[PDB]
Each structure stands twice: as structure tokens, then as C-alpha cells.
Amino acid sequence: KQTGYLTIGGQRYQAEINDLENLGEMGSGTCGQVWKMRFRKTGHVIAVKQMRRSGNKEENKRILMDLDVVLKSHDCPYIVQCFGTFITNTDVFIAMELMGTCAEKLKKRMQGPIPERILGKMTVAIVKALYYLKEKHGVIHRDVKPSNILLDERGQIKLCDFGISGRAGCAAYMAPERIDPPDPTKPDYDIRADVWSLGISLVELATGQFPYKNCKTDFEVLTKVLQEEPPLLPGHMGFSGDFQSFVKDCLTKDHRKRPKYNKLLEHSFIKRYETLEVDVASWFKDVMAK
Ligand SMILES: */C=C/C(=O)N1CCC[C@@H](n2nc(C#C)c3c(N)ncnc32)C1
């Protein structure tokens, strides 16, 4: 790998950091400070993550760990693409494709449920992203959630933040088998805990509310996951039978029964939103403009 260049859309300039104008930070980063930045030759805007050599040794490790994955996933359309990097005596700058926002912040702006047609095209993207990292690189995300699903003005939906990926994330979306690992721990007991997390997220974004109510502590959530029934989609909101049975499949608590990505990608709910046209781009711009 190299650090001189910026490969965008087939081209590849050879600039340094000062060739970019800093237009501000895009929220307090949890895996590195992220700036929205603009070229001085052309005016094109990108996202640029900064790792200070002086930074916390633990954040920096995750920044480099997320960088390790996104350098290897250029050919996956459903993962935030990295354009290149710069290494100065004091910083590392990671150039990323500029995205609109996360689905967690999208939910707060909507002030309500997100339509099924959008969650549809989201499901196809995340599952295929989680599947690519598994099949091609044997990596698991280990922290899927609405704040890790980025959308943009063009209607793209990509997964991000592989900071704790590997060959413990947020507790609310953690899978049953990660909360209490099996009696003898097989190395790949973890291989499908991400499916359960995306199911929790789909229920959250579809209903506008997190399915485990009134937990004042992290552990209290963990106990509901294991004691209460899986929180399937309600019946009184016009959700289709395909959407409800896909959410039921992912939310099967017994991990030896949760279907592999192999057959989740066969699901009708997926096959519909592969060939179905949905103007997520226009729907995105509208909620933002609101
Ligand atoms: C819900 C969005 C969110 O809170 N953040 C946290 C701060 C970083 C920010 N962000 N990260 C990346 C990356 C990689 C991007 C990209 N690529 N585009 C827009 N915003 C991003 C997400």
C-alpha cells in the first residue's frame, strides 16, 4: 500500500494535506475526528479522518483497524470507500467518500418511523456488506447499529466503522450468543451475531423506538435480550409479510438456528428490493431539507 495518492473515480492525483480546504468537522467522531474538506484545485468535497500521533493509543488502534478493512474492500459497493491516506510526522489523514449521515441521526430528524421501502434497500446493502467481509476476508463487524449505516444525497447506503472488527460493541444490539457464549466455545460461534444486530436495528428504524423499553443500565438491556421474547415487528403498521418474516429470521435467538447469509440473501424480502426501484436519493434530500 502507498500514501501519496488520491484515487477517486478512476483518477489518481498525488497531493498532500495542504491541497485541501477544511470546511469543518462532521460531528464528534467515535472512531476518529472527521472533517468535511474541499479541494483547492477543483472544489470537490470529501470526508477526511485525522489520527493524531499524540492521540489516545486505544482510539488510534481502532482507527488503524477500521482503516485495515476499508483498504481491502474497494470492490464492495456497500462499504464506505476510502480514497487514500497521508502520513505526516505528526498525523495520519484518511480520505473517505463523503456521505450524508447515519440512520440514527436520520431517525431523529424524521421524528418517526422510516418507510419500509427505505429499510428494504437498506437491508439488501448491509447484509451484502456483512456477507462480503465474511466470504472474502473472514471478518465480522461486531458492532452493527443505525449509527453505522451511512446514507447520502445520491441514495447510497453503506456500512462503516470497523474499529472493533476482527478475524465488545454496543450492548443494546448485541446478539444472545455474544452475551452468554456457549459451554464449549467454538471459534466461529460468533459468525452470525451481526445478523441479530441488524434485526434489532430494522425494528428500531421501522417502529421509531428501541424495542427494549425503559432500561436504565447496559446490563438491564442484556437481561431483556435473554429473558424476553425476540421483539418482532408489530402487525398494525402495514409492514409486508416478507419484511416481518425476514425480521423474524434474523431475530432467532438460538444461533445454531439463525440462517447463514447464504440463505438470507435468498429471502424474498431481499429478492424484491434487488430488482425494485426505490428513490432513496429523493427521500433522503427531503428529510434532510426538513
Ligand atoms: C450518524 C453519523 C455519525 O454520527 N458520524 C460520526 C462522526 C463521523 C461521521 N462520518 N464518518 C464517516 C466515515 C468514514 C463519514 C463519511 N464517510 N461521510 C460522512 N460522515 C461520516 C459519522
Q: What angle do CA 14, 153, 285 make, to 5 degrees?
A: 155
Q: What is the number of domains present in the chain?
A: 2
Q: Is any ligand 1 atom within 6 A of the Cβ of residue 103?
A: no
Q: Is any ligand 1 atom within 6 A of the Cβ of residue 81?
A: no
Q: Is any ligand 1 atom within 6 A of the Cβ of residue 101?
A: yes
Query: Do 7 and 85 lie in a common domain?
Result: yes
Distances (CA, A) of 104 to 113, 155, 182, 204: 12, 16, 31, 9
Range of the domain at 27: 1-99
**Angstrom distance (rounded) from CA 102 to CA 152:** 9
**Angstrom distance (rounded) from CA 235 to CA 18:** 55
Q: Which of 140, 146, 89, 144 is nearest to 114 (CA)?
A: 146
Query: Do 82 and 117 lie in a common domain?
Result: no
**Angstrom distance (rounded) from CA 284 to CA 274:** 19
> Which atom of ligand 1 sits closest to the CA of residue 82?
14
Q: Which of 117, 123, 178 is nearest to 146 (CA)?
A: 123
**Angstrom distance (rounded) from CA 168 to CA 179:** 10
Query: Do 114 and 75 lie in a common domain?
Result: no
Q: What resolution in angstroms, rounded to 1 decimal? A: 2.6
The length of the chain is 290
Query: Do 94 and 195 lie in a common domain?
Result: no
**Angstrom distance (rounded) from CA 32 to CA 96:** 12
199 assigned binding-site residue: no
Q: Which of 4, 158, 134, 16 is nearest to 78 (CA)?
A: 158
User: Cell 492521540, residue?
Assistant: 55
Q: Is any ligand 1 atom within 6 A of the Cβ of residue 108?
A: no
CA of residue 102 to ligand 1 center, whole Å: 7
Query: Do 163 and 258 lie in a common domain?
Result: yes
For the chain, helix (H) and strand (E) counts, in that order, are: 10, 8
Cross-strand pairs, 96: 47, 82
Please indicate the experimental technique that yielded this structure: X-ray
- The grid coordinates listed for 132 are 462480503
Query: Do 90 and 107 lie in a common domain?
Result: no
Query: Do 93 and 221 lie in a common domain?
Result: no
Cross-strand pairs, 13: 6
Identify which of 8, 30, 34, 81 to mutate to test ligand 1's pocket (most ligand atoms within 8 A of the CB).
Answer: 34
Other C-beta atoms lying within 10 Å of the C-beta of residue 3: 12
Cα torsion 34, 62, 136, 273 to 10°: value is: -50
Q: Answer with the one of 51, 76, 99 that is the final residue of a domain.
A: 99
Query: Do 68 and 9 lie in a common domain?
Result: yes
Q: Answer with the one of 79, 99, 119 that is the final residue of a domain.
A: 99
Query: Do 83 and 107 lie in a common domain?
Result: no
Protein residue with its CA nearest to atom 7 in ligand 1 = 29
**Angstrom distance (rounded) from CA 113 to CA 111:** 7
Burial of residue 112 (number of CB atoms within 10 Å: 0-12, 13-18, 19+):
exposed
Q: What is the CA radius of gyration of the chain?
A: 19
Query: Do 55 and 193 lie in a common domain?
Result: no
Query: Do 93 and 178 lie in a common domain?
Result: no
CATH number at residue 115: 1.10.510.10
| Residues 125/133, Cβ–Cβ less than 8 Å | no
Query: Do 165 and 249 lie in a common domain?
Result: yes
31 assigned binding-site residue: yes
Catalytic residues: 143
- The grid coordinates listed for 7 are 484515487
DSSP assigned state of 153? T
> Which atom of ligand 1 sits closest to the CA of residue 99?
18
Q: Answer with the one of 57, 72, 99 that is the final residue of a domain.
A: 99
List the alpha helices (DSSP H) in the chain.
57-72, 103-110, 116-137, 176-179, 193-207, 218-227, 241-250, 261-264, 268-275, 280-289
